[PDB]
UniProtKB/TrEMBL annotation, chains A, B, C, D:
<keyword id="KW-0378">Hydrolase</keyword>
<keyword id="KW-1015">Disulfide bond</keyword>
<feature type="disulfide bond">
    <location>
        <begin position="105"/>
        <end position="152"/>
    </location>
</feature>
<dbReference type="GO" id="GO:0046872">
    <property type="term" value="F:metal ion binding"/>
</dbReference>
<keyword id="KW-0479">Metal-binding</keyword>
<feature type="binding site">
    <location>
        <position position="247"/>
    </location>
    <ligand>
        <name>Ca(2+)</name>
    </ligand>
</feature>
<feature type="binding site">
    <location>
        <position position="216"/>
    </location>
    <ligand>
        <name>Ca(2+)</name>
    </ligand>
</feature>
<dbReference type="GO" id="GO:0020002">
    <property type="term" value="C:host cell plasma membrane"/>
</dbReference>
<dbReference type="GO" id="GO:0004308">
    <property type="term" value="F:exo-alpha-sialidase activity"/>
</dbReference>
<dbReference type="GO" id="GO:0005975">
    <property type="term" value="P:carbohydrate metabolic process"/>
</dbReference>
<keyword id="KW-0325">Glycoprotein</keyword>
<feature type="disulfide bond">
    <location>
        <begin position="154"/>
        <end position="159"/>
    </location>
</feature>
<dbReference type="GO" id="GO:0016020">
    <property type="term" value="C:membrane"/>
</dbReference>
<feature type="glycosylation site" description="N-linked (GlcNAc...) asparagine">
    <location>
        <position position="207"/>
    </location>
</feature>
<feature type="disulfide bond">
    <location>
        <begin position="202"/>
        <end position="212"/>
    </location>
</feature>
<keyword id="KW-0946">Virion</keyword>
<feature type="binding site">
    <location>
        <position position="269"/>
    </location>
    <ligand>
        <name>Ca(2+)</name>
    </ligand>
</feature>
Amino acid sequence: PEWTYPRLSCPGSTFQKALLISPHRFGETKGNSAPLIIREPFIACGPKECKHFALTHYAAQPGGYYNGTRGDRNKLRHLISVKLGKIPTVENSIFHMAAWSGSACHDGKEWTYIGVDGPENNALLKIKYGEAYTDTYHSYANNILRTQESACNCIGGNCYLMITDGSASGISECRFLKIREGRIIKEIFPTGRVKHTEECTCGFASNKTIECACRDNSYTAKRPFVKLNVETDTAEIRLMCTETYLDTPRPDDGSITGPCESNGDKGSGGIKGGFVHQRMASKIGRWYSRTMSKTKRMGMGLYVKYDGDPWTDSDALALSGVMVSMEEPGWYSFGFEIKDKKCDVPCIGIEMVHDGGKETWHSAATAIYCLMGSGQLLWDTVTGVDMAL
Amino acid sequence: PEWTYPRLSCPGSTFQKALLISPHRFGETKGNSAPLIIREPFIACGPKECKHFALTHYAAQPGGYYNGTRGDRNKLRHLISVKLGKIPTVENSIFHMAAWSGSACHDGKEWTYIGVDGPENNALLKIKYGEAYTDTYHSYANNILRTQESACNCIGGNCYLMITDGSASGISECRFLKIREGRIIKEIFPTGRVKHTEECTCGFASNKTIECACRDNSYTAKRPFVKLNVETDTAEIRLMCTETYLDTPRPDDGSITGPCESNGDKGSGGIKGGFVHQRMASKIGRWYSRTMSKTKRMGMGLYVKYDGDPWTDSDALALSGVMVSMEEPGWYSFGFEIKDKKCDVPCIGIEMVHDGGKETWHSAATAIYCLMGSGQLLWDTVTGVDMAL
Amino acid sequence: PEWTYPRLSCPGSTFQKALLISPHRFGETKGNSAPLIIREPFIACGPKECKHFALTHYAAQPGGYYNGTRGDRNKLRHLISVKLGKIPTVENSIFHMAAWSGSACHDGKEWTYIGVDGPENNALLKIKYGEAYTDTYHSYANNILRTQESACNCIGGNCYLMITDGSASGISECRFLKIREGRIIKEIFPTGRVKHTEECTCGFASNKTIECACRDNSYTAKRPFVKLNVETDTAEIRLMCTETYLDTPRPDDGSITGPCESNGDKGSGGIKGGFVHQRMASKIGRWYSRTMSKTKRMGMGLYVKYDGDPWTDSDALALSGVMVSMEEPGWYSFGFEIKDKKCDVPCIGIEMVHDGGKETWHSAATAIYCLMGSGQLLWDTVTGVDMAL
Amino acid sequence: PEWTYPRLSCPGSTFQKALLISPHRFGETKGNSAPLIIREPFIACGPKECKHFALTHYAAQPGGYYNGTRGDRNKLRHLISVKLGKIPTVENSIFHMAAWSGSACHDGKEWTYIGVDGPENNALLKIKYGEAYTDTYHSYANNILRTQESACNCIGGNCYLMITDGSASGISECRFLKIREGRIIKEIFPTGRVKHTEECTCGFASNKTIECACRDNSYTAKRPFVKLNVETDTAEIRLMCTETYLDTPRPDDGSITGPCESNGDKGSGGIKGGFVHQRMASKIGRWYSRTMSKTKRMGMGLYVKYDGDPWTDSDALALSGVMVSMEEPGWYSFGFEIKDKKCDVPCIGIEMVHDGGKETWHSAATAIYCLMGSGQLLWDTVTGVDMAL
Ligand SMILES: *[C@@H]1O[C@H](CO)[C@@H](O)[C@H](O)[C@H]1NC(C)=O
Ligand SMILES: *[C@@H]1O[C@H](CO)[C@@H](O)[C@H](O)[C@H]1NC(C)=O
Ligand SMILES: *[C@@H]1O[C@H](CO)[C@@H](O)[C@H](O)[C@H]1NC(C)=O
Ligand SMILES: *[C@@H]1O[C@H](CO)[C@@H](O)[C@H](O)[C@H]1NC(C)=O
Ligand SMILES: [Ca+2]
Ligand SMILES: [Ca+2]
Ligand SMILES: [Ca+2]
Ligand SMILES: [Ca+2]
Ligand SMILES: [Y+3]
Ligand SMILES: [Y+3]
Ligand SMILES: [Y+3]
Ligand SMILES: [Y+3]
Ligand SMILES: [Y+3]
């Protein structure tokens, strides 16, 4: 086996409903299954397999450990995975390491697993390469050291990963780690609009550039947009200029007055958002997703723009389709690529959280849309889960 | 690994009971298992493995999602599989894709998975090659685009698949797709009697010809019989002439007056029926199954004719044995071949549906009969399932 | 991979308790497991793996299908397996074929699976090679065609298998099938004392000879002893002369008066008995097992003799150790060999049946003893199962 | 594949929390899982996999077999394993052999499994190489022959194992076994302070030397410290001189007056302790763990000293971090090494026993800490298990 590189995307001009992983369709009291209580799912693929990752509360449904599953950080939280297609139950899952913030990616040769745990003021990112724990990175702003919640990205053996640290309501200057065979070989300090960046969804724009659509939880409903040149190891961040603001909450499309760099209103709070590249010979496609509600984590719409510069383009993103109706939960979303024999398949995954408050269990299904064929997006996704059962 | 081709069948002059997959033997309230609620099972084999496929309602027994399991189409329906031999439970199964109509086949190098989902009036057939979503095909008659419910058929890398679209009670003109490494490279418009063809059970008559025994749900109890030439990529459909009408419902054997092409009576309604080839040096054997009841989906009998032309032969099919008695349910049936070291084993599988109406769960077992040795077919298959438990 | 052959046995002079497979330790109502209800377990090893085989009633514990589990023949009975070491549950097991009498063996390249089902008066032996059903053999005495209930024996690709047919209370003249790559290539008609022979436990004495210790269910408590020359394909049978009669029921040791060939008393009824070879350079060891009780299926003792001729030697077998106490069930026993890097390890497995009558479930654990090291057999095996739970 | 050897340890100056295996998070009555009841867990790694071993009472939670799970020795006890990461349930686990004292290790080519069973006064150690039972060793002091409860240690094909035998309250003179491909090829009689040594946690100090930190259950709270030279096959035992006494129970640090060899007080009783090597070019790190309580099996601290001689060094061990708080159970602890591509990762595993006395179930979680990165140990480990559920 050799190092993997991003290839030209497979043919197609539209996404379609691919797969639903809804493990709590089997968590009824009347049932005999043990789906794990999880959140922050993401997917990462290598040359033969895709892995469905999530962070678990180390508790199952049905079970006696529902209390505390709405929180994110605790000493029980672990990064888990199944082969994509398998239901993430107790027995099907594999536990990688203790983590309440994760990431993972395959470099052509081996899996890299990323897991942050530790106290709020001094958290720790841990790196696992296959079975071995290989490196760590330390909290630098002493306020919840955090990572992508989606796949990291490997090229020629070098895997790039966004980390962040800082107040959820204030400054969180992200950084990028260059990781090779489980070990950090460079720290990359981005320049530009670095005020607040977290939960970057990153992918390859080419063999030269990794691009991320990120979350600003404090200041803007515009997504910070990272451009990382992997040849010079330099990163730059500016807000997406598009009137189609991708964060939730958000104000009305186009209502933020001023040039591209204006913040301005409804900026506090946020959501991780899906983003994936369609690489063609002389054209680049950028696919994004955002909730159907402006304020709530309800529904999910898929958007697209071809070519241009996301930093300077005020033009609206074209609405491609409704992946999750307004009646269904649409929480975190993420991008990932499936590796076909000769080309790469861009896909958007959606976390669809089962939320009934703190007095009951709190977990998530995963819906997957992929680029396939031509036409328009045809069907939405439902979890089918009644939380009373 | 290289492309696969049909071969001479293994020696044998009779089918025998091979294996029952009855997952609901373990779905009691008093038990601790989670057999999936499924229907439309089928089996497809490659050079080392046979996968048992089905369409699931994403629901288990015991469980609290029985309502809507008598229906076929919904947003939750998925194409699943296990290694043949394994019980298709929640954990054992793998979820390939959302689909309420399915098919799959191995081409010698990789699995092609087929799955139709979407709305009634604009459904979508989706193709997966291994892990990658690779192609789609669109609804052409806008009335439930549908596919085989059994294995597609690959030769030298080219996999042929029957798709149909149109009214269940009127016109459904089927088409064939030629699929290579997950992408459609040719549409094949059949000629002849094309009024209504669905749920074709296809198989290789030789390296030149694919033949299918299909379902007319509207006009006839004779099965439409496809002959696809894979070298010229041309298909032709005519009704089976035999007096031994294979559909359910059906009138008495030989009661349809007129020449081969006559419809005539008890044609509305239908059932997918099993069909497999026994290829010998200078002789062909065609094996078929039909319900033991003329009107109801009860029982399953195995029939055989050697040589001749199914389009013009009015001779009765030889009754070979009773695979499922009149007291046991006999729903869909399908053909498949197991790959032995140097030769191919023809098999008929039978969906035995557990039907207690819409007020309880609705699922199936799968009975398997294969060509083996000489003599006569000796034993029938029962599910052993009590639906009150 | 190449054909396998019997090798010199691994060093050792005593058997010891190796492993207990007791699945119903997890079948409590208070539990969350699904151990399968089985009987007639046996084990067969290839160059890398040992598979634990049994015949299941297609039912679990806890479950609602206990009625009929004391019977042996029914339309639900299947041959199952797990990797030795795994608990045979619903999900862990693989179902090979319908069978109420079984056998299996590895030839160096692939598994041969053997399964008899069908009606009493016309039963059918079915052969599976890997995934393909390959051959059948027909009932020749029309009264429960039957087979070993233990591993068959392969050499140079030729697998030898005992089959029998005939009354349980009168004549059952056994035959041997030579099977190659799933297909029968010779029938071997044994000569000699052929009155009644069933459930042969067979093993290699050398590269030239297969020897079996069998059950006479009608006439004698002496075990018929087969000697099959695999080079000339000839088989001979005579009763074991030893005063240590191995069948249950049986009279007192040495109480049968007359020369080697005398029957005489308590001959009706019987049990399958364990038998395995310890092959040394200039010496052979024969290991056998028999119940501790003379009349009941309670207890299991291990016995040994070196060299000599089992047909003419009246000398008592040396008692080696008590594998199962009088207080524990001791039902069927069998021989098998584990494949070490350069040598073979002889082992005796014991079926320990949980018998509460017909009004409850009826299944079995498996105890394994193997040759290992020097000294004397040290510890007995209990199932630890309380049938009320 | 070729024989494995200890290598330079991976870069790192601190241990961090790596992974919790807490199978009883799933054993609620309201739950649908079957975690095995186990104790004495330990981990051993080969070049591609780590296996998490334990000794089971052949019982699950929930279950009806809780009575007797506080004891150690019985006829049901077995050595089991899962891939490290997987929850050790009835279905996930594999049963290696009957054993109420265990060990295991990988030699670069195959797994060696060690398991002691038998009666108190004549126990038997059993060796399994892959699937084959290969050798045994006999009781020499006739009072509970016993082994490591942690991984044995292989170099160039030779695997070294500590065995002991004798009163738990008096003399237990340990021996070492040199095991090659599952067969004992040398007995090694240690010299020196040999009064009482058991449950050695062993590791490679270098390619020349294996060092062990052991338990004296009778005379001292100092750990007997073995140094085995693998080239000459000689062993020597002396008590650890450090004032930081590692056993539990124990008096205050440095309260044992006298030279290094002095016993003196609170010596009766004890606990197996963790111990692993950090091998660097011209420096050795020795990592140890002891309970946080002096008297009770509560908490677990990690300690470290670099260089020097454990036999003569009276200096306090540096407190590195608190892996398990005083409020959480801290029972047996053990050392193991994970194999990275070019170096070895030292790790400490901690058995966290759920103890509610003999009137309920008795089992354990496993906490893992590994060397990763720089700084200081950051977070403790809780089981999260409520034993009423
Ligand atoms: C990226 O680089 C590799 C070789 O370095 C090449 O094979 C591949 O086609 C390139 N990817 C794109 C998108 O051009
Ligand atoms: C089909 O063709 C392949 C080569 O093209 C050949 O090996 C095979 O035997 C042929 N099949 C039949 C049924 O003759
Ligand atoms: C049996 O035959 C093969 C060669 O045919 C040989 O390698 C093996 O050692 C022989 N077995 C015995 C028991 O001598
Ligand atoms: C131990 O020995 C082997 C070769 O004998 C060598 O490859 C390895 O690096 C040595 N280990 C250490 C720790 O020096
Ligand atoms: Ca925001
Ligand atoms: Ca019809
Ligand atoms: Ca008898
Ligand atoms: Ca002590
Ligand atoms: Y959060
Ligand atoms: Y339908
Ligand atoms: Y019987
Ligand atoms: Y103990
Ligand atoms: Y399971």
